[PDB]
Structure formats: C-alpha cells, structure tokens
Amino acid sequence: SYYDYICIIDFEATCEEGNPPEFVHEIIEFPVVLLNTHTLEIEDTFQQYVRPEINTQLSDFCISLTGITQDQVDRADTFPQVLKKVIDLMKLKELGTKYKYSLLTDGSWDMSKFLNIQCQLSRLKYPPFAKKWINIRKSYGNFYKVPRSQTKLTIMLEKLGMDYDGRPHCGLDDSKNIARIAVRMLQDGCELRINEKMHAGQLMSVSSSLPIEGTPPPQMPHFRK
Numbered sequence: 707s708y709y710d711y712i713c714i715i716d717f718e719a720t721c722e723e724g725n726p727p728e729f730v731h732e733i734i735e736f737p738v739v740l741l742n743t744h745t746l747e748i749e750d751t752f753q754q755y756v757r758p759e760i761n762t763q764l765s766d767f768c769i770s771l772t773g774i775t776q777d778q779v780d781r782a783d784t785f786p787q788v789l790k791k792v793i794d795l796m797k798l799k800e801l802g803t804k805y806k807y808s809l810l811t812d813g814s815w816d817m818s819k820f821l822n823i824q825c826q827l828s829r830l831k832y833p834p835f836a837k838k839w840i841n842i843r844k845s846y847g848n849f850y851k852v853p854r855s856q857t858k859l860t861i862m863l864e865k866l867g868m869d870y871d872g873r874p875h876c877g878l879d880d881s882k883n884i885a886r887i888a889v890r891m892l893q894d895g896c897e898l899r900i901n902e903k904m905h906a907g908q909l910m911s912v913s914s915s916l917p918i919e920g921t922p923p924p925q926m927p928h929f930r931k
C-alpha cells in the first residue's frame with residue numbers, strides 16, 4: 707500500500723554566474739514540505755538556512771538569484787547541525803516508524819549533486835534515508851508522455867494550468883509548488899513512486915514496476931572517519 711507522506715526537499719546552493727563547471731556548491735537553504743497523501747494537504751513546512759564553510763561569501767549572482775542574503779547565511783547553522791534538525795523534525799512527524807513515507811525532489815540534482823557534494827564537504831556519511839527518491843520531473847515525463855525538456859518546473863505548471871506561487875529560487879516556495887504538482891498528479895491518477903537512486907555515488911534509475919517500499923526512518927549519519 708501507498709506512502710502516507712511525501713517529503714519534498716528542494717535545496718538552494720551557492721553558485722556563480724555562467725555556472726562555472728568546477729565551482730564547489732554548498733547547500734545554503736534546506737526546506738522540508740510534508741505532503742499527506744491521504745488528505746492531499748501540505749501538513750508541515752520547515753525552512754532553515756545553512757552557513758557555507760568553503761566559499762563562505764555568497765556571490766552577487768547568488769544573492770540575487772535566490773534572494774538569500776549574506777547576513778542570513780552568516781547567522782545560520784552549519785550543514786551537519788541543520789541536518790540533525792531536519793532529522794529531528796522527521797522523527798517528530800514519525801516518518802519511517804508510524805508512517806510510510808518517501809522523498810520527492812524536482813529533478814535529480816538535489817540528492818545526487820547538492821546533498822552528495824555537501825556530505826563530502828561536511829565529512830558525513832551520505833544518509834541512507836536519502837539514497838532513493840521520486841524525481842517528479844521523471845514521473846511527469848513518463849505519466850504525461852513528454853520529452854525531458856518539457857518537464858522544467860515552468861512548463862509543468864503552465865501545462866497543468868497553474869501558477870508559480872511566491873518567489874522563484876526560494877527553496878521553500880519552490881518545494882510548495884512542487885508539492886502542488888504532486889497533488890495534482892496524484893489526482894490525475896498517477897501513482898508517484900521512487901524512480902531514482904544513488905549507487906556507488908552515481909545516479910541510477912529504479913524500476914517503476916516494483917512494489918511500493920517505504921524509506922527507512924531517518925538516522926543522523928556519523929562523521930566519516
């Protein structure tokens with residue numbers, strides 16, 4: 707039987723203009739949006755900013771694209787501290803123990819790039835609970851049967867006859883819009899399910915024809931020795 711909760715995560719990260727290929731991203735915003743699959747309502751939202759430690763000064767391009775200011779990241783906890791809190795929130799809403807749940811992200815960068823890089827930077831083991839997720843862009847592409855380029859957030863909203871609510875590149879607002887699409891897709895009868903994973907630190911697909919399996923209750927990973 708189906709997930710009780712979909713847990714939507716969409717990060718914001720440091721960046722440069724022109725998107726330089728060798729620039730080391732760090733997570734600067736870690737939102738969580740909890741969607742109850744039964745009531746189809748967004749039940750919980752939590753926002754937290756993260757303080758980068760490598761490239762600590764946000765670029766102008768970044769401050770403007772995301773809206774996040776230096777004073778915000780400066781006053782924020784470091785990633786491991788923020789992760790402990792996200793895990794504590796998840797533990798509070800009893801995910802993995804009382805309720806069957808799954809992660810959902812918009813694309814495959816949040817887990818396989820941003821969280822992946824960040825854990826290396828923070829010297830953390832990659833948290834098991836985040837090794838499998840629902841990439842909604844993929845879900846959408848397969849459900850409505852459109853090429854990959856048509857699954858950009860902008861187009862998904864447009865084609866479903868919806869609007870972008872709130873600020874672009876603000877992770878919380880982004881996550882909420884994502885959840886709003888999830889709802890709509892569930893309503894259109896699409897069974898959202900895990901379709902992507904990490905394996906040997908590489909992005910890999912996951913068979914869509916296999917039974918619904920909950921994500922394990924989250925734990926706080928240790929520091930890599």
Ligand SMILES: Nc1ncnc2c1ncn2[C@@H]1O[C@H](COP(=O)(O)O)[C@@H](O)[C@H]1O
Pocket residue numbers: 716717718719720721722723724725771772874875876877880
């Ligand atoms: N146009 C862009 N140029 C460079 N980096 C970007 C751009 N759009 C998004 N990103 C990176 O991806 C992160 C999250 O993407 P988004 O979900 O589009 O806000 C941002 O915090 C940026 O670090």
Ligand SMILES: [Mg+2]
Pocket residue numbers: 716717812816
């Ligand atoms: Mg994103």
Ligand SMILES: [Mg+2]
Pocket residue numbers: 716717718875876877880881
């Ligand atoms: Mg975003």
